[PDB]
Amino acid sequence: LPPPRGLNLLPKSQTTLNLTWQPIFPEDDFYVEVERRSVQKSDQQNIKVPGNLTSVLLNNLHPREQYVVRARVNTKAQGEWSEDLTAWTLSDILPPQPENIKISNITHSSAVISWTILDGYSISSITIRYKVQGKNEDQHVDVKIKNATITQYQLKGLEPETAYQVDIFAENNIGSSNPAFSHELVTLPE
Amino acid sequence: GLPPPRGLNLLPKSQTTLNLTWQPIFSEDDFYVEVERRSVQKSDQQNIKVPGNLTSVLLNNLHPREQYVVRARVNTKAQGEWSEDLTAWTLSDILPPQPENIKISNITHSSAVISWTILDGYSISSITIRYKVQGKNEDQHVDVKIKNATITQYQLKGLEPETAYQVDIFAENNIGSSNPAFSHELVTLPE
Numbered sequence: 001l002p003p004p005r006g007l008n009l010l011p012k013s014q015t016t017l018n019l020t021w022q023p024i025f026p027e028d029d030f031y032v033e034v035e036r037r038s039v040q041k042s043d044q045q046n047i048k049v050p051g052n053l054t055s056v057l058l059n060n061l062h063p064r065e066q067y068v069v070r071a072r073v074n075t076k077a078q079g080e081w082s083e084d085l086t087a088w089t090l091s092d093i094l095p096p097q098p099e100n101i102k103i104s105n106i107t108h109s110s111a112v113i114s115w116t117i118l119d120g121y122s123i124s125s126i127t128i129r130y131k132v133q134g135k136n137e138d139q140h141v142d143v144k145i146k147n148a149t150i151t152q153y154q155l156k157g158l159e160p161e162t163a164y165q166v167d168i169f170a171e172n173n174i175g176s177s178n179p180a181f182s183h184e185l186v187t188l189p190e
Numbered sequence: 191g192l193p194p195p196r197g198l199n200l201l202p203k204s205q206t207t208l209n210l211t212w213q214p215i216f217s218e219d220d221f222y223v224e225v226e227r228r229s230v231q232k233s234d235q236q237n238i239k240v241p242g243n244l245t246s247v248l249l250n251n252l253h254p255r256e257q258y259v260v261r262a263r264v265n266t267k268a269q270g271e272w273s274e275d276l277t278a279w280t281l282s283d284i285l286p287p288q289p290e291n292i293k294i295s296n297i298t299h300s301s302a303v304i305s306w307t308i309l310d311g312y313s314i315s316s317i318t319i320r321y322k323v324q325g326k327n328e329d330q331h332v333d334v335k336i337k338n339a340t341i342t343q344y345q346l347k348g349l350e351p352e353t354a355y356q357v358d359i360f361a362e363n364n365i366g367s368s369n370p371a372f373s374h375e376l377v378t379l380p381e
């Protein structure tokens with residue numbers, strides 16, 4: 001038999017992952033073999049679940065640890081395995097600050113910021129906070145980037161000859177990252 | 191008649207408290223600070239004696255988002271001159287209302303000024319203007335944070351020409367943000 005279609009692996013907690021698939025079409029009579037397997041440690045479990053149900057909760061997992069998962073259908077006959085799905089369980093700790101922070105392309109009313117995030121901490125978003133560097137500080141701007149794939153952003157409509165303070169936070173299930181230092185940005189008309 | 195304490199300041203601490211601080215003082219004894227507070231909305235006035243050698247009273251047993259007028263004096267054998275009125279709202283127990291008078295204007299290819307207005311007495315400490323592209327893609331959005339309720343306008347800058355933005359505008363407060371029933375549309379020009 002062919003493996004389950006529509007296989008999707010999502011982290012629902014710090015110790016649990018949820019594998020879902022599309023309902024299997026029956027003659028008789030079958031079950032779904034699910035194999036999950038840790039990367040950071042040597043830990044494989046193998047679960048049999050009745051064919052008519054559509055998902056399994058994989059539980060008793062460790063925090064911020066990635067697991068590789070595959071599945072199949074057996075009858076009788078041993079079905080061919082699905083492709084390997086991977087996922088991290090949610091973080092137990094606060095996420096690390098984005099590394100390789102590079103401010104460049106500095107213009108009169110714009111600049112480009114680039115960074116790198118470490119995978120493994122369930123970073124769901126990053127925020128780019130920028131404000132005028134003066135001692136007043138009555139307002140700032142948060143650019144909220146909701147997909148952690150994006151590695152770069154261009155700030156726009158900045159004021160010329162102005163010094164800005166720029167910070168970059170990464171947010172996960174626990175909370176935001178804590179920056180030790182900010183970054184400077186000075187525009188030029190010229 | 192002695193003059194009142196100097197450097198009088200009234201800070202809202204909680205929903206039921208305000209803190210009145212002043213510059214401490216030290217002829218012959220004894221002396222105490224008479225502090226009066228009174229509700230604007232309700233009819234609730236109280237008179238509090240505190241010994242003259244401490245620097246602050248916490249005026250307690252007040253009601254949520256209620257305005258209060260405060261004054262003070264230094265009494266001895268004779269009663270002193272009253273201070274000027276201090277006024278403050280206690281912190282709110284609800285979310286603030288959405289800002290009315292949302293007038294967008296001066297729309298250019300990369301600029302779009304926005305002005306609003308807020309109702310006082312809700313302890314509104316900041317307002318957030320949010321703006322993203324009209325598309326349903328939840329990739330990016332920009333939260334402009336304005337940390338004083340004094341500021342009434344703001345000019346958006348560096349927007350993309352010929353584009354539709356979905357502007358929201360929240361008001362924040364000791365409980366939480368306001369809840370917009372509706373967003374606002376912003377077209378941009380050529381360029």
Ligand SMILES: *[C@@H]1O[C@H](CO)[C@@H](O[C@@H]2O[C@H](CO)[C@@H](O)[C@H](O[C@@H]3O[C@H](CO)[C@@H](O)[C@H](O)[C@@H]3O)[C@H]2NC(C)=O)[C@H](O)[C@H]1NC(C)=O
Pocket residue numbers: 010018019020054055056057
């Ligand atoms: C793992 O996977 C998903 C969530 O990530 C869960 O599937 C769902 O579970 C219940 C149904 O028992 C519901 O919350 C979801 O909707 C259900 O099916 C339809 C939805 O159209 C409704 O008519 C039902 O009333 C019912 O609510 C359901 N969602 C889907 C798409 O299947 C699953 O429970 C979760 N946990 C485990 C332990 O498997």
Ligand SMILES: *[C@@H]1O[C@H](CO)[C@@H](O[C@@H]2O[C@H](CO)[C@@H](O)[C@H](O)[C@H]2NC(C)=O)[C@H](O)[C@H]1NC(C)=O
Pocket residue numbers: 209210211246247248
């Ligand atoms: C009322 O307000 C003032 C200022 O917030 C408080 O005075 C402070 O007291 C603590 C020590 O107990 C220190 O932070 C300083 O000595 C004071 N600060 C200043 C700025 O003077 C006061 O304690 C508050 N509460 C009461 C009940 O009086």
Ligand SMILES: *[C@@H]1O[C@H](CO)[C@@H](O)[C@H](O)[C@H]1NC(C)=O
Pocket residue numbers: 050052053
């Ligand atoms: C799967 O089959 C078993 C047979 O006992 C039944 O208990 C269960 O409700 C079935 N689930 C379905 C049809 O979703």
Ligand SMILES: *[C@@H]1O[C@H](CO)[C@@H](O)[C@H](O)[C@H]1NC(C)=O
Pocket residue numbers: 105
């Ligand atoms: C910024 O630098 C990169 C790499 O050279 C390139 O996109 C371009 O030269 C610059 N872009 C500007 C100034 O808009």
Ligand SMILES: *[C@@H]1O[C@H](CO)[C@@H](O)[C@H](O)[C@H]1NC(C)=O
Pocket residue numbers: 243244
């Ligand atoms: C004020 O004087 C009284 C005298 O009973 C004393 O209890 C209190 O500690 C004094 N406060 C000071 C010196 O701050």
Ligand SMILES: *[C@@H]1O[C@H](CO)[C@@H](O)[C@H](O)[C@H]1NC(C)=O
Pocket residue numbers: 296298301303
């Ligand atoms: C309109 O925008 C331009 C350029 O951004 C600015 O110079 C001008 O002051 C604005 N006009 C008003 C009436 O706000």
